Every structure is written in structure tokens, then in C-alpha cells.
Amino acid sequence: ARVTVQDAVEKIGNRFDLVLVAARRARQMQVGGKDPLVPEENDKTTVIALREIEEGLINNQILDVRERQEQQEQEA
Amino acid sequence: GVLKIVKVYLAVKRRIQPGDKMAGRHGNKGVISKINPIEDMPYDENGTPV
Amino acid sequence: LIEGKAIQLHPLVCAAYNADFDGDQMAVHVPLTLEAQLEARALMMSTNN
Amino acid sequence: TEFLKPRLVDIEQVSSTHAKVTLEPLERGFGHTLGNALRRILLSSMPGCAVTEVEIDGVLHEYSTKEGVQEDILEILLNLKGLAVRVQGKDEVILTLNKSGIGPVTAADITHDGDVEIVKPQHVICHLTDENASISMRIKVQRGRGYVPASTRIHSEEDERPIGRLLVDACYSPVERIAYNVEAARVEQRTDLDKLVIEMETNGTIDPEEAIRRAATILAEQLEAFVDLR
Amino acid sequence: GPEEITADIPNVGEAALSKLDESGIVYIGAEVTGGDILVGKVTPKGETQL
RNA sequence: CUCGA
Ligand SMILES: [Mg+2]
């Protein structure tokens, strides 16, 4: 997902949701400190998010569940 | 309101680079794109490069 | 990154720009944030247009 | 069907510069492969000598003039780039020029040592017009390869050089232009063999028996990374 | 107070004052680059809070 | 105002 973003946009559904989802995910690795799932292979934090999206590992429902469970874990 | 004025005259020498506008006399403009080596230019059967 | 003082452009995008190489000039704008950097890869990259 | 190998067979001197070297014999394909892989190296990288720094006394920069000479000092720097010297023993020499009196200043008036030899003594450097006027300079000659401009040398130095030591652009390569021709070789039974007539043209600071040996030493060194290491 | 052209310059070492002469103006024929100081001129500053 | 696309 470096040259073109045709693989990623056919999973989320439209470009304007893909941009917001990848911008939300790409900030959890910038300052939040959460670790990436795909191997990095020397890339910035934008293309790692755009590659996590295109392999079905990051969505909007997954990004909501994965932080609500950790907010409940912060409650405990 | 001025005490003294100094004036300094530099002398810049400039070669050609990729970007310098060159043009003929018949209205064919141009931007220089690449400065090849001498041996890459097309040469005729007497040895002179172009 | 090339040495020199001239923005080197791809020869196929000149139909979109209407740019003839006879002394044209082009402006270079950088996106700063992390949202704008993702709006230049998925919305405005030249392989999408 | 084993092979046949070429050899440096004939060398003749048309003039002090123009030469014509033939190679014989070759097979069909290699007559046009070596003839193009010996032009692309003899034009690019051949070691020669050239003038680098000129220091004329009394003059600060290159954009002024001196009394009693016809040209500007910048025209003298443009004249001193086309000087064909040949340094044998050392790797860097300094030559002196002294002249006084009405007349031109040829390149033969340089008080040379035993090793350097100005090969074209009829070159023209200056023009003196007054009797009282004189000129005196010291000229540095180095050994190099390719083309090294003045901005690279002033950027890649760090000691403070004194005001007055002008810098000249240095073009080091001796070969001016070179062509080659492939004719049918004269072999009695292997009829389709070729010969290769490399037609060289330079200035007098190179030897055509040595230039092809350097240009084939380089080619047999660069192919040494292909023959064993994969 | 008036301004002055001095060879003394604050917060600048010897590496830029090599081409400035006794009086503070650059020598004729000195090869300069981008950023080097040609005329050393200092100006008085009214005192500020810190 | 003059010049460049
Ligand atoms: Mg145009």
C-alpha cells in the first residue's frame, strides 16, 4: 500500500473513511506507544497503518473494541 | 541620519546547470535537462561528438 | 533527492498540468500533520488520478 | 572451434598527435565489442597533467588588469588552460615564467626542469607591449583524471590560502577525439576474421602504445568482479 | 547612540573574522561564500527584561 | 510600469 491504495479502499468502502481510520490508527503508534502488527520493514507510521488496514487487521469496529476493552482494563 | 555607507562589489561567475533557459534565433526555447558525458553523445563516422 | 536546482517531473503528468518545459515554474507545498499526509497518499497521489 | 586472440600489431604516427593503431586478428562479434568498449574508456578516464593554480605577482584577483600587457588576466587564465605538459618523475611540479621586453610570451620561455617537457612550444600566452613592462608567475601542474571544476576544489579545502593564488579549472584528459573502423582482415584460410583500426587524436602528452594498455588494464580489472564473484 | 563598524563582533568566533581587516571591511580579492561577513557592523541595544 | 508561463 505504498504505490496505490486500491487494495485498502475496497475493504473499508470509501476513501474518506479510510483516511480517518488510518489517521486514527497512525497516531496510536506515534505518541500512544502501541506496537504495530505487520512487520515494519523500515517505514514511517503512515504506511504501517495503511498496510494494517489492507490485511483485515484494523477496521473501525476493531479500533473501537480494542480501545474500549483497554479503557475497561484501565478501570480495573 | 546616515553616518557612513560601505559598498561592496562581488563578482559571481556562473556556468550552465540543469535549468538555464537556452534559445535559438528562430523562437525555439528550451531548458537544459542533462549534461551527458562526452562519450554518450551520438557521433558520426569521423569521431566528432555532437 | 537529486543534486541541482530544478524540480524533475515525470513526463506523463504534463498532459494534466499543461506544462511545457520552456521556463515554467511550479510551487512546492508540504503537508505537515498526520491527517494531511494521509490525504496526499489516498486522495491526491498521481497514481490515483 | 576454440578461439583466436588479438595482438597489438601495428602503430604508426601520422603527426606528433594523430596516431592510428590496428589490432589483428579478431572473430566476428568481438571486432565491434572491443571497438566500442575502448572508445568509452579512452574518452572518460585517462591520466594526464594539467595546470591548476596560477600566481602572478602584483595582482590580487582575476578580474583586474596589469600594465603593459594586451590581454586581461582572465584571458591569460583562459590561455593557460590549453597547455600540454608531461610530468614524468614527480606527481606535482611548480614552473616559473619570466619575461621582459616587447613581443609575445610563448610557452617555450618557461624555465623547465629535467623531468617536465612542454610538448607544444609554439603556444601563445601573452603579449607584451612596453619596454619597461615585465611579467612573472609561478604555475602549478598536477596529475589527475576526468574533469575537476574550481568550485569543487575551493569547497573541498580547509586551510587558508593567501590572497593572490588564483584557481584555474582543470581538464586532465589528454584524448581529444577518437574513432574506430572495422575492416575485413587479411587471413588466408579463416576468411571472415576482422581487424580493428582505432584512430586516436590527442595532444602530445600521451603515448598510443600506452593508452590502449591502460584502457585494457581498466577493462580487465572491472571484469574481474564478474569472473569469480558470481 | 550611533552605530559603529568594528572588527569586534559579539557571539562570533575567529572563523568568520579571518577575512576582515584591521578596520572591519573585507579585503579586495578575498574569496567569500554564502553567509560570510563582509562588513562588521554592530548596533547598540537598549536594555531589556530577562 | 517593463519582463516570464
Ligand atoms: Mg511554458
Tab-separated table of C-alpha atoms (C1' of nucleotides) and ligand atoms in Angstrom:
chain	number	residue	atom	x	y	z
A	1	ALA	CA	0.000	0.000	0.000
A	2	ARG	CA	2.872	2.324	-0.890
A	3	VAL	CA	2.301	2.852	-4.618
A	4	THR	CA	-1.501	2.732	-4.746
A	5	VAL	CA	-4.304	2.377	-2.213
A	6	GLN	CA	-6.631	0.232	-4.311
A	7	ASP	CA	-6.277	-2.796	-2.024
A	8	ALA	CA	-7.149	-0.856	1.129
A	9	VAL	CA	-10.150	1.145	-0.079
A	10	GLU	CA	-12.064	-1.972	-1.175
A	11	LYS	CA	-12.192	-3.196	2.446
A	12	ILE	CA	-13.304	-0.080	4.325
A	13	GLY	CA	-15.554	1.074	1.493
A	14	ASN	CA	-14.758	4.683	0.611
A	15	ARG	CA	-11.711	6.924	0.674
A	16	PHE	CA	-12.973	9.410	3.263
A	17	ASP	CA	-13.453	6.698	5.872
A	18	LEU	CA	-10.115	5.079	5.022
A	19	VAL	CA	-8.332	8.396	5.631
A	20	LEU	CA	-9.951	8.935	9.034
A	21	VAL	CA	-9.410	5.330	10.156
A	22	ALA	CA	-5.751	5.325	9.086
A	23	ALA	CA	-5.209	8.713	10.725
A	24	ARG	CA	-6.713	7.406	13.955
A	25	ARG	CA	-4.590	4.246	13.886
A	26	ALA	CA	-1.396	6.052	12.848
A	27	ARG	CA	-1.488	8.255	15.957
A	28	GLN	CA	-1.635	5.374	18.423
A	29	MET	CA	1.853	4.375	17.248
A	30	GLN	CA	3.199	7.939	17.109
A	31	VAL	CA	2.658	9.088	20.698
A	32	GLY	CA	0.457	6.429	22.312
A	33	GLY	CA	3.178	3.813	22.016
A	34	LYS	CA	1.092	0.858	20.852
A	35	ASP	CA	3.045	-1.614	18.777
A	36	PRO	CA	2.324	-2.390	15.115
A	37	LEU	CA	1.020	-5.765	13.976
A	38	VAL	CA	2.548	-6.051	10.487
A	39	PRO	CA	6.379	-6.148	10.416
A	40	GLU	CA	7.719	-2.641	9.966
A	41	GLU	CA	10.425	-3.162	7.267
A	42	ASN	CA	11.705	0.422	7.691
A	43	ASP	CA	8.615	2.544	7.121
A	44	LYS	CA	7.015	5.616	8.638
A	45	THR	CA	3.927	5.308	10.818
A	46	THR	CA	1.555	6.169	7.945
A	47	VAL	CA	2.305	3.269	5.602
A	48	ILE	CA	2.274	0.819	8.525
A	49	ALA	CA	-1.317	1.881	9.209
A	50	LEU	CA	-2.204	1.651	5.514
A	51	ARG	CA	-0.756	-1.879	5.473
A	52	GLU	CA	-2.508	-2.923	8.685
A	53	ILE	CA	-5.798	-1.854	7.092
A	54	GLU	CA	-5.313	-3.791	3.852
A	55	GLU	CA	-4.757	-7.149	5.601
A	56	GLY	CA	-8.006	-7.054	7.585
A	57	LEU	CA	-6.353	-6.443	10.958
A	58	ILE	CA	-7.576	-2.856	11.523
A	59	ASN	CA	-11.115	-1.559	10.983
A	60	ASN	CA	-13.340	0.947	12.730
A	61	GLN	CA	-15.186	-1.614	14.861
A	62	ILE	CA	-11.898	-3.292	15.792
A	63	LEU	CA	-10.391	0.096	16.651
A	64	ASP	CA	-13.401	0.835	18.859
A	65	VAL	CA	-13.414	-2.562	20.612
A	66	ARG	CA	-9.631	-2.625	21.111
A	67	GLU	CA	-9.723	0.704	22.961
A	68	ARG	CA	-12.950	0.122	24.907
A	69	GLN	CA	-11.550	-3.124	26.335
A	70	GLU	CA	-8.406	-1.240	27.352
A	71	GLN	CA	-10.458	1.548	28.936
A	72	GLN	CA	-12.241	-1.155	30.938
A	73	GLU	CA	-8.800	-2.554	31.801
A	74	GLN	CA	-7.821	0.931	32.977
A	75	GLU	CA	-10.982	0.919	35.110
A	76	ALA	CA	-9.702	-2.203	36.894
B	1	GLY	CA	20.632	60.454	9.505
B	2	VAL	CA	23.459	58.478	7.862
B	3	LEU	CA	26.982	58.206	9.250
B	4	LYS	CA	28.801	56.241	6.550
B	5	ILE	CA	27.971	53.977	3.618
B	6	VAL	CA	30.057	50.998	2.503
B	7	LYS	CA	29.531	49.456	-0.935
B	8	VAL	CA	30.956	46.032	-1.802
B	9	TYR	CA	31.110	44.749	-5.385
B	10	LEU	CA	31.146	40.970	-5.716
B	11	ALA	CA	31.918	39.085	-8.932
B	12	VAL	CA	29.880	35.919	-9.425
B	13	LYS	CA	30.808	33.558	-12.246
B	14	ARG	CA	28.069	31.186	-13.375
B	15	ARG	CA	28.248	28.079	-15.545
B	16	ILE	CA	25.295	26.278	-17.119
B	17	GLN	CA	23.171	23.980	-14.965
B	18	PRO	CA	20.040	21.929	-15.498
B	19	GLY	CA	17.526	24.758	-15.515
B	20	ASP	CA	19.177	27.539	-17.504
B	21	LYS	CA	16.939	28.746	-20.331
B	22	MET	CA	18.641	28.480	-23.727
B	23	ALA	CA	17.158	29.520	-27.044
B	24	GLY	CA	17.977	29.888	-30.715
B	25	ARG	CA	17.293	32.815	-33.003
B	26	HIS	CA	14.134	31.367	-34.576
B	27	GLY	CA	11.994	31.163	-31.461
B	28	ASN	CA	12.845	27.677	-30.219
B	29	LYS	CA	13.227	27.982	-26.452
B	30	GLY	CA	14.411	25.302	-24.069
B	31	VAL	CA	15.507	24.155	-20.629
B	32	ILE	CA	18.745	22.199	-20.306
B	33	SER	CA	17.876	18.765	-18.941
B	34	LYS	CA	21.029	16.669	-18.681
B	35	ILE	CA	24.756	17.259	-19.020
B	36	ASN	CA	25.907	13.937	-20.531
B	37	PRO	CA	29.470	12.653	-20.593
B	38	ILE	CA	31.365	13.172	-23.826
B	39	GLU	CA	31.237	9.521	-24.871
B	40	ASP	CA	27.441	9.190	-24.677
B	41	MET	CA	26.586	11.748	-27.354
B	42	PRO	CA	25.881	10.499	-30.894
B	43	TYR	CA	28.999	10.712	-33.045
B	44	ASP	CA	29.469	10.469	-36.792
B	45	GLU	CA	31.885	8.181	-38.620
B	46	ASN	CA	34.760	10.668	-38.232
B	47	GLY	CA	34.773	10.727	-34.419
B	48	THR	CA	33.380	14.168	-33.635
B	49	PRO	CA	30.623	14.138	-30.989
B	50	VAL	CA	27.526	16.322	-31.200
C	1	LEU	CA	16.765	13.615	-3.903
C	2	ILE	CA	18.792	14.878	-6.851
C	3	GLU	CA	21.572	17.409	-6.970
C	4	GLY	CA	20.958	20.570	-8.939
C	5	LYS	CA	18.368	23.303	-8.766
C	6	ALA	CA	15.379	22.086	-10.787
C	7	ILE	CA	12.290	20.064	-9.895
C	8	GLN	CA	12.393	16.973	-12.084
C	9	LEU	CA	8.893	15.946	-13.133
C	10	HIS	CA	7.559	12.775	-14.712
C	11	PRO	CA	6.892	13.155	-18.467
C	12	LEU	CA	3.397	11.630	-18.351
C	13	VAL	CA	1.738	14.058	-15.921
C	14	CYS	CA	2.392	17.022	-18.238
C	15	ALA	CA	-0.914	16.466	-20.020
C	16	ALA	CA	-2.735	17.172	-16.756
C	17	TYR	CA	-0.631	20.178	-15.760
C	18	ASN	CA	-0.439	21.648	-19.286
C	19	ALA	CA	3.247	22.271	-18.626
C	20	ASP	CA	5.722	22.811	-21.438
C	21	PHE	CA	9.378	22.747	-20.406
C	22	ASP	CA	10.292	26.204	-21.667
C	23	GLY	CA	10.863	28.026	-18.400
C	24	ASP	CA	7.774	27.026	-16.437
C	25	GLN	CA	7.755	27.228	-12.662
C	26	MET	CA	5.956	25.048	-10.139
C	27	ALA	CA	5.257	25.573	-6.457
C	28	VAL	CA	6.127	23.022	-3.781
C	29	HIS	CA	3.843	22.720	-0.760
C	30	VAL	CA	4.483	20.313	2.110
C	31	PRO	CA	1.759	18.715	4.249
C	32	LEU	CA	2.632	18.869	7.933
C	33	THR	CA	0.153	16.885	10.019
C	34	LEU	CA	-0.635	13.178	10.097
C	35	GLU	CA	-4.117	13.592	8.613
C	36	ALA	CA	-2.940	15.751	5.702
C	37	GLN	CA	-0.106	13.319	5.000
C	38	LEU	CA	-2.769	10.623	4.578
C	39	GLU	CA	-4.858	12.881	2.343
C	40	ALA	CA	-1.944	13.107	-0.081
C	41	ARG	CA	-1.413	9.344	-0.356
C	42	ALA	CA	-5.002	8.110	-0.696
C	43	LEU	CA	-6.672	11.147	-2.287
C	44	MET	CA	-4.153	13.213	-4.279
C	45	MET	CA	-1.394	10.811	-5.329
C	46	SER	CA	-0.672	10.821	-9.042
C	47	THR	CA	-1.311	7.080	-9.398
C	48	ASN	CA	-4.923	7.667	-8.341
C	49	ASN	CA	-5.666	10.390	-10.921
D	1	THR	CA	36.193	-24.005	-32.614
D	2	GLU	CA	38.382	-22.909	-29.692
D	3	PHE	CA	39.147	-19.159	-30.257
D	4	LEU	CA	41.642	-16.734	-31.776
D	5	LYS	CA	43.202	-13.932	-29.757
D	6	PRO	CA	44.162	-10.421	-30.922
D	7	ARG	CA	47.502	-8.666	-30.510
D	8	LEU	CA	48.877	-5.126	-30.753
D	9	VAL	CA	50.300	-5.499	-34.251
D	10	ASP	CA	50.890	-2.063	-35.817
D	11	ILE	CA	51.389	1.514	-34.599
D	12	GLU	CA	52.151	4.462	-36.871
D	13	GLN	CA	52.482	8.201	-36.257
D	14	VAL	CA	50.613	10.463	-38.661
D	15	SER	CA	51.802	13.561	-36.795
D	16	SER	CA	53.011	14.405	-33.297
D	17	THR	CA	49.387	13.999	-32.133
D	18	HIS	CA	47.473	11.964	-34.722
D	19	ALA	CA	48.020	8.198	-34.491
D	20	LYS	CA	46.409	5.082	-35.959
D	21	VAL	CA	46.602	1.715	-34.178
D	22	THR	CA	45.408	-1.608	-35.606
D	23	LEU	CA	44.534	-4.869	-33.855
D	24	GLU	CA	44.537	-8.236	-35.618
D	25	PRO	CA	43.000	-10.794	-35.660
D	26	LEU	CA	39.506	-10.812	-34.195
D	27	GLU	CA	36.457	-13.003	-34.606
D	28	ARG	CA	33.134	-11.716	-35.927
D	29	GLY	CA	31.440	-10.330	-32.820
D	30	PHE	CA	34.446	-9.088	-30.859
D	31	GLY	CA	35.536	-6.672	-33.579
D	32	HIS	CA	32.646	-4.363	-32.732
D	33	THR	CA	32.506	-5.000	-28.971
D	34	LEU	CA	36.111	-4.145	-28.123
D	35	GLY	CA	35.958	-1.231	-30.557
D	36	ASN	CA	33.161	0.345	-28.527
D	37	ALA	CA	34.441	-0.652	-25.095
D	38	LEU	CA	37.749	1.034	-25.937
D	39	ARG	CA	36.197	4.317	-27.024
D	40	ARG	CA	34.035	4.596	-23.905
D	41	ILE	CA	37.091	4.319	-21.639
D	42	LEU	CA	39.709	6.287	-23.620
D	43	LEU	CA	37.470	9.372	-23.599
D	44	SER	CA	36.404	9.268	-19.960
D	45	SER	CA	39.353	8.400	-17.711
D	46	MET	CA	42.979	8.646	-18.834
D	47	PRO	CA	45.675	10.136	-16.556
D	48	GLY	CA	47.160	13.394	-17.800
D	49	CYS	CA	48.746	16.567	-16.485
D	50	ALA	CA	47.115	19.981	-16.363
D	51	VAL	CA	47.578	23.472	-14.957
D	52	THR	CA	45.763	24.106	-11.676
D	53	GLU	CA	46.946	27.276	-9.899
D	54	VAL	CA	48.487	30.426	-11.370
D	55	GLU	CA	50.051	33.108	-9.162
D	56	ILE	CA	51.046	36.344	-10.917
D	57	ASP	CA	52.724	38.870	-8.645
D	58	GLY	CA	51.204	42.290	-8.096
D	59	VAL	CA	47.680	41.119	-8.979
D	60	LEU	CA	45.034	40.265	-6.380
D	61	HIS	CA	42.143	38.688	-8.300
D	62	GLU	CA	41.367	37.579	-11.851
D	63	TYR	CA	39.009	40.464	-12.715
D	64	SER	CA	41.641	43.210	-12.990
D	65	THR	CA	44.373	44.159	-15.430
D	66	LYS	CA	48.131	44.565	-15.400
D	67	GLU	CA	50.114	47.285	-17.130
D	68	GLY	CA	51.932	46.666	-20.385
D	69	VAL	CA	50.057	43.527	-21.432
D	70	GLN	CA	47.419	43.290	-24.128
D	71	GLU	CA	45.056	40.778	-22.576
D	72	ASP	CA	43.209	40.833	-19.302
D	73	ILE	CA	44.493	38.411	-16.692
D	74	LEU	CA	41.338	36.332	-17.226
D	75	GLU	CA	42.387	35.858	-20.843
D	76	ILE	CA	45.781	34.702	-19.563
D	77	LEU	CA	43.996	32.153	-17.379
D	78	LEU	CA	41.993	31.031	-20.411
D	79	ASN	CA	45.246	30.705	-22.363
D	80	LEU	CA	46.999	28.723	-19.628
D	81	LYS	CA	44.340	26.007	-19.554
D	82	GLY	CA	45.372	24.834	-23.009
D	83	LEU	CA	48.950	23.930	-22.101
D	84	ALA	CA	50.203	20.420	-22.828
D	85	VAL	CA	52.862	19.356	-20.327
D	86	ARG	CA	54.244	15.955	-19.363
D	87	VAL	CA	55.420	15.230	-15.808
D	88	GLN	CA	57.451	12.023	-15.544
D	89	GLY	CA	59.130	11.577	-12.170
D	90	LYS	CA	57.163	13.521	-9.573
D	91	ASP	CA	53.412	13.961	-9.183
D	92	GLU	CA	53.228	17.764	-8.804
D	93	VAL	CA	55.637	20.440	-10.030
D	94	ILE	CA	55.877	24.238	-9.960
D	95	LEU	CA	57.136	26.068	-13.049
D	96	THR	CA	58.348	29.656	-13.278
D	97	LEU	CA	57.929	32.141	-16.118
D	98	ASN	CA	59.995	35.304	-16.521
D	99	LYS	CA	59.905	37.675	-19.477
D	100	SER	CA	60.718	41.317	-20.166
D	101	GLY	CA	60.665	43.146	-23.481
D	102	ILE	CA	58.359	43.887	-26.404
D	103	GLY	CA	56.984	40.764	-28.044
D	104	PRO	CA	54.745	37.783	-27.324
D	105	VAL	CA	55.260	35.428	-24.406
D	106	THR	CA	55.407	31.950	-25.880
D	107	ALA	CA	55.199	28.775	-23.828
D	108	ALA	CA	58.824	27.943	-24.664
D	109	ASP	CA	60.017	30.697	-22.288
D	110	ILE	CA	59.226	28.664	-19.155
D	111	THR	CA	62.334	27.639	-17.212
D	112	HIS	CA	61.596	23.926	-17.048
D	113	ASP	CA	63.315	21.228	-15.016
D	114	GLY	CA	64.717	17.963	-16.346
D	115	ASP	CA	61.511	15.964	-15.955
D	116	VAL	CA	58.766	18.239	-17.303
D	117	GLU	CA	58.689	18.890	-21.049
D	118	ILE	CA	56.295	21.352	-22.679
D	119	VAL	CA	55.398	19.403	-25.793
D	120	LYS	CA	53.941	22.280	-27.817
D	121	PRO	CA	56.429	25.166	-27.561
D	122	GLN	CA	54.681	27.423	-30.091
D	123	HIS	CA	51.754	28.161	-27.746
D	124	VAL	CA	50.860	31.797	-27.050
D	125	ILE	CA	50.222	33.041	-23.512
D	126	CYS	CA	50.523	36.828	-23.506
D	127	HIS	CA	51.518	39.923	-25.462
D	128	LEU	CA	53.968	42.452	-24.056
D	129	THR	CA	53.833	45.966	-25.462
D	130	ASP	CA	56.074	48.203	-23.334
D	131	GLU	CA	59.825	48.030	-22.831
D	132	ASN	CA	59.752	48.655	-19.074
D	133	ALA	CA	56.890	46.198	-18.539
D	134	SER	CA	57.558	42.638	-17.408
D	135	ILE	CA	55.707	39.580	-16.124
D	136	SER	CA	56.459	36.814	-13.627
D	137	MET	CA	54.301	33.925	-12.465
D	138	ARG	CA	54.504	30.523	-10.825
D	139	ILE	CA	52.419	27.735	-12.321
D	140	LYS	CA	51.385	24.536	-10.541
D	141	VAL	CA	50.852	21.348	-12.558
D	142	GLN	CA	49.173	18.294	-11.044
D	143	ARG	CA	48.182	14.824	-12.235
D	144	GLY	CA	44.532	13.928	-12.458
D	145	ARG	CA	41.698	12.095	-14.165
D	146	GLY	CA	38.497	13.427	-15.679
D	147	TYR	CA	37.278	16.983	-15.153
D	148	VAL	CA	37.547	18.722	-11.774
D	149	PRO	CA	35.977	22.210	-11.648
D	150	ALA	CA	37.092	25.100	-9.470
D	151	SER	CA	34.063	25.093	-7.145
D	152	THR	CA	34.786	21.503	-6.082
D	153	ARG	CA	38.382	22.335	-5.163
D	154	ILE	CA	37.503	25.538	-3.307
D	155	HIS	CA	34.760	23.620	-1.469
D	156	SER	CA	36.953	20.619	-0.556
D	157	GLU	CA	39.775	22.585	1.119
D	158	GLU	CA	40.103	23.961	4.642
D	159	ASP	CA	43.468	25.705	5.076
D	160	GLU	CA	43.640	29.439	4.412
D	161	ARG	CA	45.382	30.024	1.123
D	162	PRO	CA	46.858	33.512	0.610
D	163	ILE	CA	45.152	36.198	-1.438
D	164	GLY	CA	46.538	36.070	-4.955
D	165	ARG	CA	46.680	32.337	-5.623
D	166	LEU	CA	44.199	32.162	-8.481
D	167	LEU	CA	42.481	28.884	-9.306
D	168	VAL	CA	42.098	27.527	-12.831
D	169	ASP	CA	39.616	24.892	-13.931
D	170	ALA	CA	41.475	21.679	-14.702
D	171	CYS	CA	40.725	19.393	-17.627
D	172	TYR	CA	43.048	16.439	-17.204
D	173	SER	CA	42.263	14.039	-20.034
D	174	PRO	CA	44.704	14.009	-22.971
D	175	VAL	CA	42.478	12.402	-25.608
D	176	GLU	CA	40.541	14.929	-27.695
D	177	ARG	CA	38.543	12.651	-30.003
D	178	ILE	CA	38.760	9.057	-31.174
D	179	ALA	CA	37.178	6.926	-33.906
D	180	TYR	CA	37.469	3.292	-34.930
D	181	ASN	CA	36.935	1.313	-38.129
D	182	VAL	CA	36.413	-2.423	-38.634
D	183	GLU	CA	37.714	-3.868	-41.901
D	184	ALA	CA	37.998	-7.403	-43.233
D	185	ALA	CA	41.249	-8.939	-42.023
D	186	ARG	CA	43.788	-10.482	-44.394
D	187	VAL	CA	43.902	-14.117	-43.270
D	188	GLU	CA	44.441	-16.827	-45.875
D	189	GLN	CA	42.020	-19.529	-44.680
D	190	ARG	CA	39.959	-18.099	-41.826
D	191	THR	CA	38.424	-15.626	-44.251
D	192	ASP	CA	35.760	-13.911	-42.111
D	193	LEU	CA	38.177	-12.576	-39.477
D	194	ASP	CA	38.126	-8.861	-38.676
D	195	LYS	CA	40.688	-6.217	-37.793
D	196	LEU	CA	40.108	-3.075	-35.743
D	197	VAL	CA	41.736	0.237	-36.649
D	198	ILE	CA	41.485	2.602	-33.681
D	199	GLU	CA	42.118	6.151	-34.923
D	200	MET	CA	43.336	8.243	-31.994
D	201	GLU	CA	43.767	12.013	-31.768
D	202	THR	CA	45.177	13.739	-28.699
D	203	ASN	CA	47.742	16.289	-27.663
D	204	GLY	CA	51.384	15.401	-27.216
D	205	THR	CA	51.131	14.223	-23.593
D	206	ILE	CA	50.259	10.550	-24.175
D	207	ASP	CA	51.700	7.524	-25.968
D	208	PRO	CA	49.357	5.363	-28.106
D	209	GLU	CA	51.269	2.210	-27.173
D	210	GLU	CA	50.468	3.012	-23.518
D	211	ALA	CA	46.916	4.362	-23.771
D	212	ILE	CA	45.451	1.109	-25.085
D	213	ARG	CA	47.310	-0.808	-22.379
D	214	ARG	CA	45.799	1.421	-19.690
D	215	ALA	CA	42.344	1.211	-21.301
D	216	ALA	CA	42.563	-2.581	-21.366
D	217	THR	CA	44.039	-2.859	-17.863
D	218	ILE	CA	40.961	-0.984	-16.629
D	219	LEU	CA	38.625	-3.245	-18.608
D	220	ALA	CA	40.327	-6.419	-17.375
D	221	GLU	CA	40.129	-5.087	-13.818
D	222	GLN	CA	36.420	-4.222	-13.934
D	223	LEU	CA	35.541	-7.644	-15.364
D	224	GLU	CA	37.438	-9.319	-12.513
D	225	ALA	CA	34.356	-8.774	-10.336
D	226	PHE	CA	32.276	-10.825	-12.803
D	227	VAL	CA	34.524	-13.835	-13.390
D	228	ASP	CA	34.773	-15.303	-9.864
D	229	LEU	CA	32.387	-13.456	-7.525
D	230	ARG	CA	29.108	-14.679	-9.020
E	1	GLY	CA	23.932	56.127	20.488
E	2	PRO	CA	25.386	55.808	16.995
E	3	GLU	CA	26.189	52.548	15.279
E	4	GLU	CA	29.759	51.509	14.558
E	5	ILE	CA	31.690	49.441	12.029
E	6	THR	CA	34.068	47.406	14.190
E	7	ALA	CA	36.123	44.275	13.673
E	8	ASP	CA	34.977	43.246	17.152
E	9	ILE	CA	31.726	41.282	16.848
E	10	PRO	CA	29.903	39.550	19.726
E	11	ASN	CA	28.967	35.848	19.648
E	12	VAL	CA	31.092	35.148	16.532
E	13	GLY	CA	34.431	33.342	16.667
E	14	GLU	CA	37.613	33.719	14.656
E	15	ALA	CA	36.351	31.585	11.749
E	16	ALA	CA	34.322	34.466	10.277
E	17	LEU	CA	36.708	37.318	11.152
E	18	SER	CA	39.606	35.857	9.165
E	19	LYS	CA	38.893	37.964	6.070
E	20	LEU	CA	38.018	41.168	7.928
E	21	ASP	CA	40.928	43.579	8.178
E	22	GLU	CA	42.054	45.929	10.980
E	23	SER	CA	39.232	48.381	10.230
E	24	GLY	CA	36.390	45.893	9.738
E	25	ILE	CA	35.887	45.911	5.947
E	26	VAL	CA	36.766	42.902	3.786
E	27	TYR	CA	39.982	42.715	1.739
E	28	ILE	CA	39.912	43.255	-2.010
E	29	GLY	CA	40.191	39.902	-3.743
E	30	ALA	CA	39.084	37.653	-0.879
E	31	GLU	CA	37.008	34.659	-1.947
E	32	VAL	CA	33.751	34.606	0.007
E	33	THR	CA	30.905	32.098	0.282
E	34	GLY	CA	27.291	32.235	1.451
E	35	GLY	CA	26.957	33.623	4.963
E	36	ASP	CA	30.428	35.078	5.496
E	37	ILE	CA	30.713	38.584	6.916
E	38	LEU	CA	31.815	41.379	4.583
E	39	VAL	CA	31.404	44.435	6.837
E	40	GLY	CA	31.381	44.013	10.586
E	41	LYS	CA	28.776	46.440	11.904
E	42	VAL	CA	27.434	46.379	15.451
E	43	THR	CA	24.460	48.305	16.780
E	44	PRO	CA	23.624	49.344	20.351
E	45	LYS	CA	20.665	47.665	22.020
E	46	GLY	CA	18.526	49.187	24.739
E	47	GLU	CA	18.350	47.052	27.851
E	48	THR	CA	15.528	44.520	28.070
E	49	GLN	CA	13.923	42.373	30.727
E	50	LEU	CA	15.033	38.769	31.118
F	1	C	C1'	5.193	50.197	-15.359
F	2	U	C1'	8.740	46.509	-18.081
F	3	C	C1'	9.517	41.093	-18.388
F	4	G	C1'	8.405	35.399	-17.953
F	5	A	C1'	4.434	30.805	-18.319
G	1	MG	MG	5.613	27.234	-20.694
